[PDB]
Design a protein around this ligand. Structure first.
Ligand SMILES: Nc1ccn([C@@H]2O[C@H](COP(=O)(O)OP(=O)(O)OP(=O)(O)O)[C@@H](O)[C@H]2O)c(=O)n1
Ligand SMILES: Nc1ccn([C@@H]2O[C@H](COP(=O)(O)OP(=O)(O)OP(=O)(O)O)[C@@H](O)[C@H]2O)c(=O)n1
Ligand SMILES: Nc1ccn([C@@H]2O[C@H](COP(=O)(O)OP(=O)(O)OP(=O)(O)O)[C@@H](O)[C@H]2O)c(=O)n1
Ligand SMILES: Nc1ccn([C@@H]2O[C@H](COP(=O)(O)OP(=O)(O)OP(=O)(O)O)[C@@H](O)[C@H]2O)c(=O)n1
Ligand SMILES: [Mg+2]
Ligand SMILES: [Mg+2]
Lengths: 559, 372, 186
């Protein structure tokens, strides 16, 4: 086993999550079975209690574990599947050892937070890094730990102590620390004193740093690096600069130009880890897929405009997984992406009574879009705008994907505007009216990776061509409310055909509309399973249809 | 896009530790501080939120006091040091409230002054602008007093020398372009000698093309060297500050081992007509700050005094020459003291007020504003 | 936006009247002539549409011969004056076809010469540039032979005189600025 801990910061907004998700990617190019752990200093047990307004979207794992965003960034960069244990939190570990007290397992000793709770952290990291994460049950070679918060805090405090002991309870040369740090620029001069005042605290809290990964606004001066290597004890080759480049998928290749694999190969003796040619050649092939997709980003010019239609579009992190899946689908089509933020409530005609500028800008963005996405919203208060965009996408022939709530407004749209029931309703919203035309029903939660089976006649469905025509699809779910299955025999007659269903047959999970270029609902969330080299099939479908050449993508899949 | 108050909270921890307790928290953010940013700094530092002053950039540094005055800082310091208990006369207090109105007036004049004046600052090391910080600041005072907005033209003097045409023509043209564009010219008391021929050519230009001129320290000395080479007709005449062990007879300077600090300059008797003496209020003695090892060779003065280069001011012994003004030019002055250092934001240094007035036009109207 | 061939058709009427008969109709339009504009000029003048040459602006006046050569004007004049019947030696003809390649070369050199040279032309009446037409044209020949693109800096000489500083400082600075900027002086 080996560990690399990514850590530090003068400030908590500094962006450690790319250097974690990008260090682990570079180590996966050596062919190593890499894994990752997030530490979050917040008290939440797991993210399911905190709304998407409050620091971004509610992620989903194979377990159903509603979790921190930063798990998702490692899953999509590293190709790995994570579990709800990979998110260490102050909530979890304190709830764990305090529940263990009432169980009695410390034999009625004191449960001081030094010794015993820092021992539970060091045990948890050693459990979790041995859980398998790739397509086979082989245990990881290297674990990347992202230490949330900063080193020099009061929510960080048990973790930085636990990791001082863990620098020895796992031997040095099986552990390395990467310290992210701030180097401000003021009046044209690079200021390395915030960094030198977090190297003092790092040595004090007891870890010793290996890298000094500065988030400067610039290239670091040769004299700036020379002084950081005088005040921190690292050699000047190790003072990596992580400055902005044309997209975040380039960041691994900047770190590779900055020798970071050659340093980590030495500093963790990675030549002593046992690897097969099936490991190593997969490693060096994955490097060439990353060099190819970044070269394709560097000279892709032909734009594709996708309208993302929903509430809270000013909080873009409320959709981080939706955005990132369109970026993967974009780079695979070799069309450059623009996403058009349509704040759905502005499409509703009553907006014309409040501000006409909003009513025109939103319908302008929607009309300009080469493809349309209803992105699995939350709450109900924007729903009429999401219905109008689904009417537009059906009648104007524009490519369409409905995710989760998106499948459900598509059924509501089709009921109101093709089946001809204008009172038909989201039972998710208009409940205590008790009306008969209910497009949905509550069936109290359903979460995690679940099996979707294709219905028998489905051969013609573009969505089934995009899934490689395989009879079952494994994808991640969230929904309380599902389509009322007593309308399905009507929709099945009117050309709205339910391509895929749950294994009991009673629950509807995919539809495709007959006789449209690409119009799909998926009631699972296709966002979360997308990887940077394997875009999620419904999202690859949307960005292909909007680019043209949907047929040529269907060959690239099925060959 | 987020304001980060953790560098500040990691210097309030150290402040309390080293044992002083803070009163104000004067942030140098790129922005206005958010009301929520101030509220959190007032939660982690113990100051109340009214005291978390923001010191962001404004149209010139002479506005900064009035931003701090909008941010209650006199009302806070009057309380927190009990300044009402200090004994003051009306001659103190009314000078206080009058000086405030001079600062409100000169900042209002900066806010709507538009008519530019371009001053060429001609010397070595112009990429190191802090090597001239007092020179720049004195021109800003003189500017705001004339009510003309300032541009200073940085002429890296060695580029004016014809040999630059053999090395890079772009430098030779840009430097002579900036010098030719200037409404007034300044030789700013340089250091060392290696740019001196460019400073002589700018002094030739300023004499023959009639452009307003001030030579400070070395500037007076290159003006004497220029005048010797180009009006008296000794082309071998030299800075003894540079060309020493040649031992030549036409020495424009001599070493006399240092001379520093505030010294008395007395005007020579006939001086009544001199614009520089009008700018000093016609007062018989001037007190100003000096630095020079080398001074004009006093055995050339009787020639220059005959040719219209008249030494308006001298040291109290008579033997040392400290000011000249050239007869029959709109404004052409050497001062061998440094006039920069004595300028105040409400009292610009008289030779520098002369230069920025001559370059603006209305040098006569400034001479009334002084002498009334 | 419409090309108006009635001023032309009202000078073809007068031409026939005063008694000469035209061969070419060399229009100074602001544009390329439309194919329908040429077809109507060839309906009202008696020339065939190939002969309605257009003489529009191009990157320098030394290109104009080669526009007329693209517009068949040697092939037309060789026919319409029977120039094959004029006696020529190879010392005539090969000097002819060599001079054509010197003109194709110097126009190709103008098409991709970029490195500027600034010459100050210092004198009175510079607002009347035709008062110096031969001076300007000789610098253009010298320019194209050096393969540097020309800018001429018009210095109205009286502005360099120090008394101008008493009348308008802007003139005194602009003129000395142009003179100081010049790579050469005339
Ligand atoms: N490979 C990555 C990593 C991060 N991000 C972006 O980074 C964001 C949030 O910043 P991040 O780098 O994850 O760190 P912070 O949120 O600043 O938090 P911390 O520094 O506490 O880790 C999101 O907007 C996400 O789009 C990204 O686009 N690609
Ligand atoms: N740990 C340190 C670093 C510097 N100094 C002193 O503080 C002075 C001012 O600090 P500065 O020169 O700004 O050093 P930097 O570390 O570069 O600060 P910054 O990065 O903000 O420019 C230095 O000349 C030095 O004498 C000090 O006392 N202790
Ligand atoms: N002295 C402090 C301040 C904050 N925190 C914790 O650290 C987390 C991340 O710090 P941050 O939210 O960034 O707080 P700020 O002080 O604003 O940091 P910055 O100014 O850099 O944004 C906070 O949510 C809080 O729980 C802490 O442990 N000790
Ligand atoms: N010699 C001519 C030419 C034209 N017409 C008539 O005048 C009308 C208007 O002239 P116009 O159409 O403008 O013909 P042009 O010669 O093209 O005029 P211009 O070039 O100015 O457009 C024509 O429709 C035609 O019936 C005429 O009487 N005598
Ligand atoms: Mg914060
Ligand atoms: Mg993060």
């Amino acid at each position: 086993m080996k560990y690399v801990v990514v850590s530090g910061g003068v400030i908590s907004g500094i962006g450690k999550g790319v250097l974690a998700s990008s260090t682990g990617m570079l180590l996966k190019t050596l062919g190593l079975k890499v894994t990752s752990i997030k530490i979050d200093p917040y008290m939440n047990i797991d993210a399911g209690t905190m709304s998407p307004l409050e620091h971004g979207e509610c992620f989903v794992l194979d377990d159903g574990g509603e979790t921190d965003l930063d798990l998702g960034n490692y899953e999509r960069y590293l190709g790995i599947t994570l579990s709800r244990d990979h998110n260490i939190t102050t909530g979890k570990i304190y709830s764990h050892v305090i529940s263990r007290e009432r169980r009695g397992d410390y034999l009625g000793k004191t449960v001081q937070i030094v010794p015993h709770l820092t021992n539970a952290i060091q045990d948890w990291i050693q459990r979790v890094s041995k859980i398998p994460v790739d397509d086979t049950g082989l245990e990881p070679d290297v674990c990347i730990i992202e230490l949330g918060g900063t080193v020099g805090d009061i929510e960080s405090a048990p973790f930085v102590e636990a990791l001082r002991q863990f620098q020895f309870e796992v031997g040095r040369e099986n552990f390395a620390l990467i310290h992210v740090s701030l180097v401000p620029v003021i009046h044209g001069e690079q200021k390395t004193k915030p960094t030198q005042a977090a190297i003092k605290d790092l040595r004090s809290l007891g870890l010793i740093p290996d890298m000094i990964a500065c988030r400067c606004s610039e290239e670091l001066n040769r004299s700036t690096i020379d002084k950081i290597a005088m005040f921190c004890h690292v050699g000047p080759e190790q003072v990596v600069n992580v400055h902005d480049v044309n997209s975040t998928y380039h960041v691994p290749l900047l770190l590779l130009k900055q020798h970071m694999i050659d340093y980590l190969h030495s500093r963790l003796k990675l030549g002593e880890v046992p690897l097969t040619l099936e490991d190593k050649e997969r490693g060096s092939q994955l490097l060439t897929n990353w060099e190819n997709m970044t070269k394709n980003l560097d000279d892709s010019d032909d734009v594709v405009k996708i309208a993302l239609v929903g509430k809270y579009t000013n909080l873009k992190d409320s959709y981080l997984s939706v955005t990132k899946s369109l970026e993967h689908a974009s780079m695979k089509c070799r069309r450059q992406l623009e996403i058009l933020w349509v704040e759905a409530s502005n499409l509703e005609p009553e907006t014309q009574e409040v501000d006409k500028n909003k009513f025109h800008d939103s319908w302008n963005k929607l009309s300009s879009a080469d493809g349309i996405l209803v992105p699995g919203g939350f709450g109900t208060r924007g729903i009429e705008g999401m219905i109008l965009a689904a009417k537009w996408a059906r009648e104007s022939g524009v490519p369409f994907l409905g995710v989760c709530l998106g499948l459900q407004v598509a059924a509501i749209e089709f009921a109101r505007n093709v089946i001809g029931r204008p009172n038909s309703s989201s039972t998710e919203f208009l409940d205590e009216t008790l009306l008969a035309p209910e497009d949905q029903v509550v069936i109290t939660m359903r979460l995690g990776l679940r099996p979707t089976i294709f219905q028998p006649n489905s051969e013609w469905s573009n969505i089934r061509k995009l899934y490689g025509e395989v009879n079952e699809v494994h994808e991640r779910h969230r929904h309380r409310y599902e389509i009322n299955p007593k309308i399905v025999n009507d929709m099945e007659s009117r050309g709205f055909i339910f391509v895929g269903k749950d294994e009991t047959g009673q629950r509807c999970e995919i539809f495709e509309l007959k006789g449209h270029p690409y119009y799909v609902g998926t009631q699972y969330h296709p966002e979360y399973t997308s990887k940077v080299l394997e875009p999620s099939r419904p999202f690859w479908g949307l960005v292909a249809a909007a680019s043209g050449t949907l047929g040529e993508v269907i060959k690239d899949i099925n060959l």
